[PDB]
Amino acid sequence: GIFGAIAGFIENGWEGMVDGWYGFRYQNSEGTGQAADLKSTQAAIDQINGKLNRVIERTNEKFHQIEKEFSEVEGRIQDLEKYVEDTKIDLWSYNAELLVALENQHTIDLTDAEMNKLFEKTRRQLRENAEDMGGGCFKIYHKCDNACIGSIRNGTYDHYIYRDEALNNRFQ
Amino acid sequence: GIFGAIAGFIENGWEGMVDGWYGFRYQNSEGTGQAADLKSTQAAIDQINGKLNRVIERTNEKFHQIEKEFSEVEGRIQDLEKYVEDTKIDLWSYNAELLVALENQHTIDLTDAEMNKLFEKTRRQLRENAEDMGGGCFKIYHKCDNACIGSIRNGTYDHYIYRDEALNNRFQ
Amino acid sequence: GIFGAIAGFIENGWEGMVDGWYGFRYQNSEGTGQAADLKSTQAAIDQINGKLNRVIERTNEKFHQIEKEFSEVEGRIQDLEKYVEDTKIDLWSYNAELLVALENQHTIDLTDAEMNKLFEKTRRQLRENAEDMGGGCFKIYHKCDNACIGSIRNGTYDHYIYRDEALNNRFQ
Amino acid sequence: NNTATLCLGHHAVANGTLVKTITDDQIEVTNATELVQSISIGKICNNSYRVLDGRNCTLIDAMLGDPHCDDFQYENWDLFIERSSAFSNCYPYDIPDYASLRSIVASSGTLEFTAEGFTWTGVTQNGGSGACKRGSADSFFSRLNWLTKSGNSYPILNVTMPNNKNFDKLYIWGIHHPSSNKEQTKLYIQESGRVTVSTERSQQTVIPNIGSRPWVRGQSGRISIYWTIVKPGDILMINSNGNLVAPRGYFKLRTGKSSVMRSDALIDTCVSECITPNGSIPNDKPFQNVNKITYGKCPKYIRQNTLKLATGMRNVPEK
Amino acid sequence: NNTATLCLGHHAVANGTLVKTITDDQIEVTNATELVQSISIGKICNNSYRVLDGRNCTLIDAMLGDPHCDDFQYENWDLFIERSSAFSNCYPYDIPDYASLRSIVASSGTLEFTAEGFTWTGVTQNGGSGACKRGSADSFFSRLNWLTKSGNSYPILNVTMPNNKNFDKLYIWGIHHPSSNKEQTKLYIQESGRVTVSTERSQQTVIPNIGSRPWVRGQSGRISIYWTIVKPGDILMINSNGNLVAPRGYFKLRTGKSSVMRSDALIDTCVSECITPNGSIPNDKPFQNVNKITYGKCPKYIRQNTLKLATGMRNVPEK
Amino acid sequence: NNTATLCLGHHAVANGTLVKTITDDQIEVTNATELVQSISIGKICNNSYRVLDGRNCTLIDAMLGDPHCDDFQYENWDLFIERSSAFSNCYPYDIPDYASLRSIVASSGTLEFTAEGFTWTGVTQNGGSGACKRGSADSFFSRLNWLTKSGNSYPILNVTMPNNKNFDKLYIWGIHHPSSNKEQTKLYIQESGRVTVSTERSQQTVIPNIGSRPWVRGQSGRISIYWTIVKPGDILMINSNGNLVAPRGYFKLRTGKSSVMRSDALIDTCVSECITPNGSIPNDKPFQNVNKITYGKCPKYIRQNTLKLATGMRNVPEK
Numbered sequence A, B, C: 001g002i003f004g005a006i007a008g009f010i011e012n013g014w015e016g017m018v019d020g021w022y023g024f025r026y027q028n029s030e031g032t033g034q035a036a037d038l039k040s041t042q043a044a045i046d047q048i049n050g051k052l053n054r055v056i057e058r059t060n061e062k063f064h065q066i067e068k069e070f071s072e073v074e075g076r077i078q079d080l081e082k083y084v085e086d087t088k089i090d091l092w093s094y095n096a097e098l099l100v101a102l103e104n105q106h107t108i109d110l111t112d113a114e115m116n117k118l119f120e121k122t123r124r125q126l127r128e129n130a131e132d133m134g135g136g137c138f139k140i141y142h143k144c145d146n147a148c149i150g151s152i153r154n155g156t157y158d159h160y161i162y163r164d165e166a167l168n169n170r171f172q
Numbered sequence D, E, F: 001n002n003t004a005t006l007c008l009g010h011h012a013v014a015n016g017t018l019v020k021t022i023t024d025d026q027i028e029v030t031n032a033t034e035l036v037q038s039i040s041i042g043k044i045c046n047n048s049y050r051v052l053d054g055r056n057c058t059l060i061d062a063m064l065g066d067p068h069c070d071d072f073q074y075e076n077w078d079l080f081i082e083r084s085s086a087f088s089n090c091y092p093y094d095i096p097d098y099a100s101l102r103s104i105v106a107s108s109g110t111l112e113f114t115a116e117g118f119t120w121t122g123v124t125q126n127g128g129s130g131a132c133k134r135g136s137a138d139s140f141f142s143r144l145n146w147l148t149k150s151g152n153s154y155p156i157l158n159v160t161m162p163n164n165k166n167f168d169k170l171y172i173w174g175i176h177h178p179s180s181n182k183e184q185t186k187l188y189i190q191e192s193g194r195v196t197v198s199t200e201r202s203q204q205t206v207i208p209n210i211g212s213r214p215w216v217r218g219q220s221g222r223i224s225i226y227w228t229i230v231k232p233g234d235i236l237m238i239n240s241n242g243n244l245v246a247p248r249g250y251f252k253l254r255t256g257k258s259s260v261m262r263s264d265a266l267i268d269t270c271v272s273e274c275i276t277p278n279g280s281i282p283n284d285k286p287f288q289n290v291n292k293i294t295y296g297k298c299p300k301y302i303r304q305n306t307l308k309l310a311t312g313m314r315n316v317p318e319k
């Protein structure tokens, strides 16, 4: 997308991730783990369901219309009937083609932005206890077990607790 | 919002703020205060007024047209006159709905972006004199009376003046 | 645009720069310089080439259509023939105006974004070796000649090499 | 204090307004403005355009010259108002392709009448009827002329009216339909009636029909109304031998911005550049749900009765 | 360990689906959904709506009352299905403005027939023909009535059937065209036959024509069918001196949601709110490419046969 | 030395072009491209399509077979160009629903003619006129045939022409209108003229009208042109007793991609797949403001004379 996160500073996706659209991965004192982030995945799938509900919220009921096929050749008024229909189709064909183009473009944009939103959210929590490694990866400068990683996932990481150790590991 | 500022990392707006759209709330040695920014407020109102001039006041002038209401039933050509009018009303109605949709979805995005731009604008000023607390808030690590804030508001805060004080408070 | 890089935090463009759409301007030990970034340029050019090819893909092949100009005054059916062609043109006219409005508003945005992306891609390389002066300018705190700046363009700047030097010059 | 806190943010309001977007069907914003003009004044405006009230007269009754439509003899309009409460108080008539004549007269936007002295030889003019009383005594349509036999015989008529003017002349004419076979030979002598209007480019021949129609204020007969446009340089020519409802003259056609509208609204003094059957509406908004029939500088009609365009950010108040 | 790596990412798949965008024509996403309904069931569902198969009868054949369309005398419908294998097995007839009558009947959605007593003085009713057998013996269109002279003379008939009911009556009538000059004086006595239907708001006079037409199941003559609608309060009137095909009564008009459709599609039990000439289709996708002719709650037809809608992010797998 | 300063940015141009956006009315970008085709070549190209110069002939004059349109007897086209400087140099004629006939011939896209030997018993063929000179001597429309009485009487003509072909036959015919009463009995003996062309499906009966018309190259008469299509298997039958303008044969109708256009443009050698009354235009753009009348692979007409599609970023030059 336009935010350059998906197919960008995050080089590629994860076929291993099967339980969410956006998640984490890590390595620490208690091995190496993967963990989806639901709130972002829920923000993504709500908007797509919104689009799909908006596109699929109405089909106009229509009854007695003009004749759209003929057997003989009549002349003047028969042309107008074919023309009115031919014009109607072209305009809806355009309206359908543009809608697809705009919507799909917005889909790849809002999915991308949500990938980036999560990154800035995770950064903001870490404060001065981690530096951006690039590739969509952080480097936390203290021992961060699964209990520690879990607080980040659930939006409850206190930087003050690990500030001194990390701040000392960064500059020595 | 697609940038994740409004209804995002900023928890909520302020009903008390009645002197602008975006703004700063601060705590310092001289107490606590509030003030609305005029520049970022102006930008958003310019883009909205820009849209509102494009859509408004281009109503076309139409004079004599076909009949759209009939007393007697005439069959062939009457059905066409209703059908053409029916086709016109549907296509314009669609266009109206699509316009309103795209404008509103863009209206939330540019108002969201502006908030986010005002934030990064402030970070840039503060250099290494302030850390990102969270909730779109900044911890300034030096004494900052109303003059120090007034300078930040007007975009004339000089980080070198308060560096040695702040840089020491951040790392000790 | 919406991202606030072009005509936003960056003061203005560079007419000197002719060999690309985006790039760097530096000052170091071997004098000053300018270099246009090929990757980010090429990207933005592909998206705008993509737009062109979509809008200039098809033109429909029509043949026998209704009479749109008349000599005599007939009455009923001639007005309908005018009204169809009048309504047809009005709808396509609006379809053309809206398209060119959306496209261009999108064009300024994706081009603005490609500035903001290149700026960030460069911040992420430098790590803690450089601060952010303002106006899209980094202050690097170590001796970086044209070979080093060369590694910053291609995307192979190893901050570890210069870290100790830069961390010394920033905080002493 | 050796520190300070700086929190950025945005404004908010208590009573927000909901809008539709690409994703959300209902999302709350700080502000909005209406794009659909759903309400109306309830009366037609008259200072922007010359709006002419037809009253009990229809457009074609006034055109033909019905006794109760002597007011609209030379008047012109921008928008003519045909009332539902309107009648035809003259000879019982009909028109093949009625809407075409009504449309051409409406687009013309004028009813000025330049009379012409046709050379009627061997026939009496100014025929009348008891079902078309002009004040009290018997009369007929003022722009038409009933021709009948003058004494013993009805000759085969043969007039010519050359167009030396540089515009399209509109001659309104017709043919009479007697009620009985005695009435054919009584009023018009000749056994078989016939009318043949013929320009250089075309020809229109009409045949009358002797038969009983429903009782319409005394008369059990009919008069079919026809018309013939004559371009600059072309010549008019009638060829009849009975039942000829002759033209008194011609109306002056013009390609204007005029029309006709059915309405039972009040036309009171105001200013507005958009008129409907319900009345006048302001054209500041680009859409409207009042009525699909419109005239002037109007907003387009749509099925929606409201469309809230966002004029502000997303609203999210305090707790 | 004193450090910890913390990477962020998004999912990917092995077989992504391509879509179109403003910039990219064929960009691959994780997952997309179809918006153009391409396939059909292959048959018309007749539960969602009351679908009536016309079978060998056209809608106008059944209206008049063709011998092989006796089943469709009081039957009504939501969607009438005309077949390509349908015929007209009665007198050779034609209709000027045929489709207009076909529309009015199809839109009304009912062929219920209320008969009425007309005073046909001095003529014989129930006239028939060999090209319109009702079992074996000669017959005629059941809702029409062929009149001919009584004995020595054909009197100039003249009937009035007032509309005291509170709806639009639709009378079906016509005029006969003999094959030869003997037949005009044989069957109708009077030399020049004529028919003149006339309401208060209109008139419809017709003249027959004596001449040979092609051999249609024995008959070399014709019958031009017509129709007249009468509004509440308005009176019906006929005035003929020959060649009158009398009306038996009137059909009940009603502003319904009905229509007619040409199709050779099977009509079996199912449920679906959109019916085409190819059979019913589901109305969940917004567009369709099955047919431009439609009935019911239907998607809007377009020329494209497929338009995928991304329902997921851009897909980028591992190398 | 131990510092650098890396700054980033974008290019700029001296002459940025202006464009329209969702927000800003007039905003300046580095580059753009035109989507509305405003200009034209000024001449019609005729390598892509087969453009046929109609000259002083109209489509219907060439169809009938006018003396000066003998070049268009068997020729065919993809697009036909009627010139405003066109004339009819034969008998004075009119056509009710003229445009329908015009359109049918245009859509057909050909004027090949298969003649058929009709059985004209007791009448004289090749009836000519002074107002239609084929070189010098008197003549008539080549595809039509003016019949008159042969000696003392005029027999009630009767001919049939079955369609054993597998396409729609188009028979062009008409009826004559004598100037005076003596002339009806002179040329056609029979007092009351009549023509009745009829298929198995439909009929067309016409009656002539004796009366004077305006002077058209030495004639005060008229000929009303009609046409009748006959389907595979269906049979043609004419039944007249005077004033028959008989057909020599039929034209071959085809469902083609041909049309007609009123233009006064020059038609020279070049290649361009779109055609307007002002010549050919390039179809590379999606829109155009040249003319609403179009033929071939053309862009869509709109009200605007320009629409600029930005193809570069926002321009912001140095100071």
Ligand SMILES: CC(=O)N[C@@H]1[C@@H](O)[C@H](O[C@@H]2O[C@H](CO)[C@H](O)[C@H](O[C@]3(C(=O)O)C[C@H](O)[C@@H](NC(C)=O)[C@H]([C@H](O)[C@H](O)CO)O3)[C@H]2O)[C@@H](CO)O[C@H]1O
Binding pocket: E127, E128, E129, E130, E131, E138, E146, E148, E178, E179, E183, E187, E219, E220, E221
């Ligand atoms: C070649 C030959 O010898 N032929 C005659 C043949 O013409 C004729 O047959 C009858 O012809 C008359 C027309 O003069 C009718 O067409 C007869 O048709 C019937 C029918 O439909 O059965 C009889 C019926 O009683 C008639 N009904 C009425 C109300 O008139 C109708 C009707 O007249 C016409 O058909 C409508 O045009 O026709 C047809 O049998 C026979 C008997 O004269 O003699 C042959 O020799």
